[PDB]
Design a protein around this nucleic acid. Sequence first.
DNA 1: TTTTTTTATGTACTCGTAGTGTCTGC
Lengths: 343, 337, 123, 366, 373, 366
Amino acid sequence: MIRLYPEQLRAQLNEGLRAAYLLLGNDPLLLQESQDAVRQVAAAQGFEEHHTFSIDPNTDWNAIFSLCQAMSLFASRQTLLLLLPENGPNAAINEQLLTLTGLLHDDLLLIVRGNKLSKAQENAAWFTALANRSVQVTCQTPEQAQLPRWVAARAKQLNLELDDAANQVLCYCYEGNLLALAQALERLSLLWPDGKLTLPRVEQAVNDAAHFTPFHWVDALLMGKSKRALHILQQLRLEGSEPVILLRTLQRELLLLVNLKRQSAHTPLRALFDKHRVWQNRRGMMGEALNRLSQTQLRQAVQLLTRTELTLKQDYGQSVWAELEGLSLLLCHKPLADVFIDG
Amino acid sequence: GPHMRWYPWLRPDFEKLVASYQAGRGHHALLIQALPGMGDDALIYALSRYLLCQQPQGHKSCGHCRGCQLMQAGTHPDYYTLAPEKGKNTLGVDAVREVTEKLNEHARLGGAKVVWVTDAALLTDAAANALLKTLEEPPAETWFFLATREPERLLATLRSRCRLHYLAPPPEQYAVTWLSREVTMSQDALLAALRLSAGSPGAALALFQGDNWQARETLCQALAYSVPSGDWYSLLAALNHEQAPARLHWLATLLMDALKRHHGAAQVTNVDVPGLVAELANHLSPSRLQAILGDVCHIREQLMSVTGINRELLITDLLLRIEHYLQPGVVLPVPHL
Amino acid sequence: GPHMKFTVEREHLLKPLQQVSGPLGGRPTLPILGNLLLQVADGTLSLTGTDLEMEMVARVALVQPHEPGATTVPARKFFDICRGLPEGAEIAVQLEGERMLVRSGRSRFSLSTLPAADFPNLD
Amino acid sequence: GPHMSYQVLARKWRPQTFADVVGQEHVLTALANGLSLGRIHHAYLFSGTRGVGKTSIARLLAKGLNCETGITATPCGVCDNCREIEQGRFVDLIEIDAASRTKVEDTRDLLDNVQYAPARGRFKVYLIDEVHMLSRHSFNALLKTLEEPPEHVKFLLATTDPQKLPVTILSRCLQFHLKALDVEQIRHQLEHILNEEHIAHEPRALQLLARAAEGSLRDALSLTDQAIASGDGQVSTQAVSAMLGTLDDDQALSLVEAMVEANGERVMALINEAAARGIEWEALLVEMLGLLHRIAMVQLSPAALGNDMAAIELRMRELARTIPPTDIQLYYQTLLIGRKELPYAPDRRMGVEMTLLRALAFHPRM
Amino acid sequence: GPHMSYQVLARKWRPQTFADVVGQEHVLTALANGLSLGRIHHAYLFSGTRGVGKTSIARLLAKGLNCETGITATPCGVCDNCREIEQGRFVDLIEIDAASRTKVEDTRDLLDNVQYAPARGRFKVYLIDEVHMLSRHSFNALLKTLEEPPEHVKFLLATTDPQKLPVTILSRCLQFHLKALDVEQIRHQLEHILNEEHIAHEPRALQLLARAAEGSLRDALSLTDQAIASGDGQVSTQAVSAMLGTLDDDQALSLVEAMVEANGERVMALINEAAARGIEWEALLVEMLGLLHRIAMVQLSPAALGNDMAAIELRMRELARTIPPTDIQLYYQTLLIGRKELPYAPDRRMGVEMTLLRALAFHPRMPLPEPEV
Amino acid sequence: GPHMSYQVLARKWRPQTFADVVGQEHVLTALANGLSLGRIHHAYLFSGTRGVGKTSIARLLAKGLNCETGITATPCGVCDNCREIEQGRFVDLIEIDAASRTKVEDTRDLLDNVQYAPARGRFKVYLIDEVHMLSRHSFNALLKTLEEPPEHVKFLLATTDPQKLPVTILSRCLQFHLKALDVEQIRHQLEHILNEEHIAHEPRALQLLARAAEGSLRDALSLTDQAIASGDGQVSTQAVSAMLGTLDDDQALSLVEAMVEANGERVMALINEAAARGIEWEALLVEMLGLLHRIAMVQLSPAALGNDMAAIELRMRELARTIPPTDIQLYYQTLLIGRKELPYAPDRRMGVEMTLLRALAFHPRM
DNA sequence: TTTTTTTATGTACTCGTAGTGTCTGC
Ligand SMILES: Nc1ncnc2c1ncn2[C@@H]1O[C@H](COP(=O)(O)OP(=O)(O)O)[C@@H](O)[C@H]1O
Ligand SMILES: Nc1ncnc2c1ncn2[C@@H]1O[C@H](COP(=O)(O)OP(=O)(O)O)[C@@H](O)[C@H]1O
Ligand SMILES: Nc1ncnc2c1ncn2[C@@H]1O[C@H](COP(=O)(O)OP(=O)(O)O)[C@@H](O)[C@H]1O
Ligand code: BEF
Ligand code: BEF
Ligand code: BEF
Ligand SMILES: [Mg+2]
Ligand SMILES: [Mg+2]
Ligand SMILES: [Zn+2]
Ligand SMILES: [Zn+2]
Ligand SMILES: [Zn+2]
Ligand SMILES: [Zn+2]
């Protein structure tokens, strides 16, 4: 199994088509781009007839197997496409994929599109049977730090000049939404075909259609970026995510921070992080937070968190969205008034 | 498993209650105010055995008629039970509605009908309201049985339409004798368990049978460690569990006994653990002890009442607020009118 | 517009109605495409049914006094009226305002129509 | 079989004629005047606390509306329609257990059939019981029908909690507030029915039942049936006293005098003794509330005291002679809050202990 | 009058002319001017509290737009269309109880038949009552029809809480908010109705009915019907006061005056008198709280008393001239706490009495003296 | 119907050329450059705020794509199909209200109509309005059609809520997001139509209409039509101000403005106006608490103001800058206590007024 | 580099299945 990124696919595709291609990632844009490149190269190499299927307990599997085992009157080369569910390949789906690999043939090219593969998913034997001769493509969304480099690289690929300001604006407005980022890049390239993009040109045709996760909010709170935390919170509210998800995601980390701040009086943070399986980036963020947070701030944060939880669960109130800004402004560097933490 | 474990203290009441049904003048709705695990379920089961029996005698079921056999097997077309669904501690309105709609048709075996709700305190407002009218004017030969921790906790409308029977707990000496017969342990711990169970022998016996006694010992040790130092956060390790309200109640009883010892009350709920209560009494002032007790009981009530609440956050915040109260110069809460 | 009239037998009308019903009756793309287009010309009757890509037209001979007009009447309702009449009874049809009147032996119906100007036709 | 299951008093003694109704004179007068004068409405909403008689009043109104004698203020009770509606087989009267048929599908299905004619009676009466349990969609489905129903249909809503109804529903109905029955009315009704059924009783027991029923005839009747079952066919004072929960001893006054003196030792000893006697804690707290109320009342105005019980009121005069009014007021407030939060306690005894410890903490030194 | 079977006060006196509406002037003028100028929008939403005239105004607009004569703001009472719409079952108006047609499967059927020409009249008036009850798919179906409807279709949308509508629906149509009626307008309408029905009435009873109506005329008129029932067909101060379950101030003013003067004996005597009358004890506390709140009103601004309390106005002002605002704060808070604690008192009379005792004992100017030491 | 004035301004003033759409340059220029330079996508998905021009711009795209004078941004409007698209119906422009045709049984027929060659124009144009309400199976069918679109068809989907669409549909559509129109653009447009409709107007009335438009030009046009109605064919400042005051719903923010300003008469007048509208009082207190919390968050950091409160951004910013935090905390405490005590009040109106009076007593004016 | 959500009841909506009315060349 050759594991690759969408940057390196072209050369591999020029090396020669592989029996199976597994497009796996959480990013729609990179998955679609890799799929388009694979299909274009296959069409160049004779693969003319394309078939698409969706994996589902409602999938007519017999039709898929017959198509994989039936020759066509025209364009004998065939491409099979599958769309993995959000849960990935289930055990029954794993057996179905094993049977499909058993019927894999030279004249048939197989493409798989779906979310990331969890360890158990590739543990299943069909994955290894494919990996004996296949290529896997990890289309994972670049993190916050890696976004400007990718945006600049794509801009240079698309033959348009981007400065630091426009790149920063695009990164701030389209994070986790690379599809909309490429839509905006096309929009700006077509709006002004001069190829030079600066702050005044890009500040017009860019909206804040970002896509975030609760982990982004928690990491923003940990790093102390109050403005970024508020941006993530507002974006998540506009998206419609359940506030209880945010409450739990913050609660786990906040309880860990409280315990580690309590324990820091006897043991340095280096051993404390290793005690409870804290990862390296998480180790750095947590160390920064524990150094920039006292006991009183953590206690007030927990008090506000439990007040918000009580408001949400027993009163069924709609003030949790506004109250979460209280935590956002309390954790970073700013103590809040007593009445807004208890009452 | 657990079944109709008849208890001696139900004997004077059961013989009475069946009499109210022997003359045929009994109320269709009998709400039993009995402490949990004290024996309300067994009494209701025996009463239903008498009621559904086609050929009964005296104060017990024949055990020979087909109704008795079907009742023993656990299946009967005229014996409906209303219990919380597996994994959920509530009684939905859908089950009550289905039962009420089934009551329209006649009894299959030609006898009477029994609808027994396991715990009326777990009724959802919609379910209790759907049961209101069915309770009021049931069809011919229909019998309702309800059990509750507290009758006043029920809906003010449902409880009105029901004859209320109170099962008096046995005197403390009789209960301690019964549990000494059942369990071979010290008298001090047994009396402490009986007082913890509000005098209900069944709840204390269940506490001893389960791992709750080990948990109480661990919590007492944690309190012993934490009282002089104020390291109340460690109590979380002993407090966070699926039975957190019981342990919060144990802590509340310990604070009760500390306040009593400061006031010098002759008898205490925690007689088996004098060292911990003495340490709590001397180390903590009564003014802050009252605030800690009130906050602990408030957290217990919040944890019990609102379903889906997170035990971790509530218990952690309670411990942190207690630690904050321990520090001098901090305002204390006052009960609200 | 107005003054259009039919006088047709059920036997000479039922079968062309079945032929022109086709796919009509279901929810259409446009509200008009549920109505058969009724036309009179040179003493013959034209039934038209359209699906934005189909057009089935049935011609019926007329030997009765009439008038060369046009209208659009709901397919299901008109077919049910023409089917429920007694066997051999003659249907007399006219128009007034936006109401198309159907008459048989001691029987009268009024149906809501649409102007022929809005009916789509294949170019 | 004349419905043997009716042996329960709450099912047998519901009134069948306007004259049989006890209390509720204002709503009865309004209904009688409306029926006699012809000022008939199409949406009556009888709202009040539980066990007051709004369902029975609504059924009597339906009987009066659908009687073959005419639109009479006093139903005959013997006509074919009256007998049928007593049997419950009357088609023209529809009783909706809205706490069970709360879905909107059933409400819409019912409202689509309002246009049809009644089978036998003049009016197609709709007895919607426990209206507040309907879904919001079910409420909003009723607006057009309640505004302008046909002349042959009438809605008789009956809720125990009018404030949960949408204002658009309260706006279309004649609201009849069923006043809670007084102690005297309950006592007289209980005496009348018990003497009708030839049941041994004592006037003091009836007074206790009326006072402890909390202004409801159904509660008093259920307590009477409980007393009958407990006392073997007689409503004896001792049995009902041990059942409802009474304080014949002066332990309440001793508890008050120990607490107001900040004597925690005596307070806890008295609590232990009372628990050893199986005291009912809520009745105990009620007695302390009454004692403190009388103490404050005599503190304001001399005499006008618990002259009923001279023995304790002498010591009460001493207490009113010593204790400042503010301490009495705060003690009463704390006892009341403890009674309020008594259900929200792991044990009733523990709740009373909480209340008394809070009372002690106000003046622990003095 | 005729009063054929007394077909309910609410239904009988529904407005039939644009001059008969009790004074929603801000919408009446707009509709009359739009009808006169020919600016007939194809969609507008009536909103406002209960029983104000939204449905009645919608019927009036359908009257004006369906009249045989030219489109006028003064529909005729002889017109065949006007008579039919008054009696209902009109050909053009389509009474659509949206609460009974929430499902989109019915809104789609409505939309399928929108293009058919009306049988009579000019505008096929779609009157949708309780619009906020429609399901989301129903609203989205209504969207494009409301944006570009047929030239002979007008939409008559009415609801109680317009905020529940999707915002684009609010955008596609005009908005008319019908303000709740003032007390004087309600009283004048009640006087008109009772005079036309020839029923004896008194000014105080009608003022009380208007006050208890809370700004909604349908409540006022149902309450007037219930008061007529309570009396022997006659509206009087005693009958309405008994029916509403309240006291006509005064008594409560004496209560609050004895409260502020620390005259506990008078407080107890007035409580005994109220018990003799047998009024609701919670009503006593509610009325005392209301009078204290009105005295606070007067304390803030002199022009805080309406004509309704004029009967005691000269008295009430004097209360605001002597009680410092902090004392009225303490009084109001104590009475509110007493009302909070009343349901848990040993007896309702006991709770009210203890509340009065606490109010007078905590009086700063005249506190209850400590007994001996 | 009668007389030309019946034409609704939301319908008659429908833009017909790209020079008529206003405030959407970032989409108009992109469409023009794409049409002129030959760059084209399989489908174009429009999105943004209500009443901004998504459907109008989609119709303009349909006009431009299907003019026989070449695929161009600016259609002539003289030839047959340009007029047929606007006046009457054009055969090759398929307009589908997806809200009316959510079920897959209609989208299946629609995609069975894509394999047929266009009649008049070169490009078969599909305009699907409110595409966010199609069913999931209909979305699957639409995705299947979009996977391999024939060269003679180009889709146009217009919607208000883009978040509901499948990500696989967004991936193949070049979404154009239209920003809410600025106040100045709305005012200039309203002045343009009013001057070209022979309707008198006054600049302050136009500014009020633009501010009340909330950014949607359709709202501005509807309020303009109502303002003309409220009066005699004249947009007077007094009539417009009265109409907006009648329709205004920001009682809470103006009320907290007056409360912090310590203007008791203004607070009472605002409470009167809120009572006239039947505003829920508990909801009013909840909104006021939310506003106070938000302004405190603004005081802590200016980033607390998101795009959700752009309408009232300036007022809240200025009331944050001018007011010390201590007054904010005291007012929040007073309002929270008042909301706690609101249910146990003689009525909600007097309870909320009493809470406001309590708040006004802190730091009053001379 | 793997990590996070409360319930109880009700109200629509859209789709396959499933069972049945009815009726047309079979
Ligand atoms: N006004 C009354 N007159 C006579 N009996 C009454 C009255 N009110 C209640 N009751 C008694 O209470 C029982 C239940 O009355 P019910 O009318 O159901 O009260 P509710 O209003 O709470 O439904 C009746 O069976 C009757 O015995
Ligand atoms: N403005 C008004 N003028 C005259 N009568 C009114 C008015 N508002 C309400 N009413 C009375 O209320 C009855 C019903 O009013 P309605 O318009 O249905 O209120 P709603 O807005 O709640 O539907 C009418 O028949 C009429 O008697
Ligand atoms: N940008 C704009 N320029 C001109 N008129 C507009 C604009 N946006 C909205 N309108 C007006 O609103 C009416 C409806 O516009 P429409 O584009 O259908 O809004 P929507 O985005 O909600 O579908 C149009 O007829 C036009 O009068
Ligand atoms: F208990 Be009743 F129906 F209000
Ligand atoms: F009662 Be109305 F139509 F709101
Ligand atoms: F108002 Be748009 F067409 F969504
Ligand atoms: Mg009832
Ligand atoms: Mg209406
Ligand atoms: Zn048996
Ligand atoms: Zn009769
Ligand atoms: Zn007319
Ligand atoms: Zn052209």
